[PDB]
Amino acid sequence: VYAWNRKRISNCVADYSVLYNSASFSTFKCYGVSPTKLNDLCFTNVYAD
Amino acid sequence: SALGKLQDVVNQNAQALNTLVKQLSSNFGAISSVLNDILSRLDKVEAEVQ
Amino acid sequence: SFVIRGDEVRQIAPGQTGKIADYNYKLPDDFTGCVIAWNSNNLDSKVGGN
Numbered sequence: 001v002y003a004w005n006r007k008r009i010s011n012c013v014a015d016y017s018v019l020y021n022s023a024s025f026s027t028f029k030c031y032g033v034s035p036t037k038l039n040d041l042c043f044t045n046v047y048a049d
Numbered sequence: 050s051a052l053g054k055l056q057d058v059v060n061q062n063a064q065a066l067n068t069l070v071k072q073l074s075s076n077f078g079a080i081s082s083v084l085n086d087i088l089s090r091l092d093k094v095e096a097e098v099q
Numbered sequence: 100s101f102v103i104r105g106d107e108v109r110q111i112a113p114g115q116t117g118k119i120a121d122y123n124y125k126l127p128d129d130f131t132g133c134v135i136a137w138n139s140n141n142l143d144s145k146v147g148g149n
Binding site for chain 3: 036
Binding site: 032033034036037039041 | 090
């Protein structure tokens with residue numbers, strides 16, 4: 001965590017419903033957007049830290 | 050400058066409408082001033098607070 | 100009244116989503132009521148599985 005790794009996400013189609021309904025996750029929270037609504041949006045970029 | 054009394058009445062009413070329109074761009078503490086940002090970003094219970 | 104796994108108790112609330120809230124049991128956004136839940140591993144679990 002002292003050297004956290006950032007991945008730029010671009011040029012692509014996501015599915016955040018597949019993420020937030022995944023059995024893999026023990027906690028999931030969102031800010032400035034609500035997770036139910038993410039599949040209706042677009043972004044100039046996404047970054048994963 | 051002779052008709053300044055009548056021009057002042059035109060100017061005050063234009064100033065008041067221009068102020069009323071520009072106040073639509075204010076957040077008032079919401080995440081956005083654009084009502085369609087709030088409705089496209091958030092679900093009902095979170096949107097109604099904004 | 101019903102049985103769910105301990106992870107899913109969060110979905111038994113007004114305004115939620117997920118396979119229980121979406122496909123099994125939905126509460127309205129203006130729900131008036133109480134949600135009551137308790138662990139039943141002493142009754143509803145079995146060795147080799149229930």
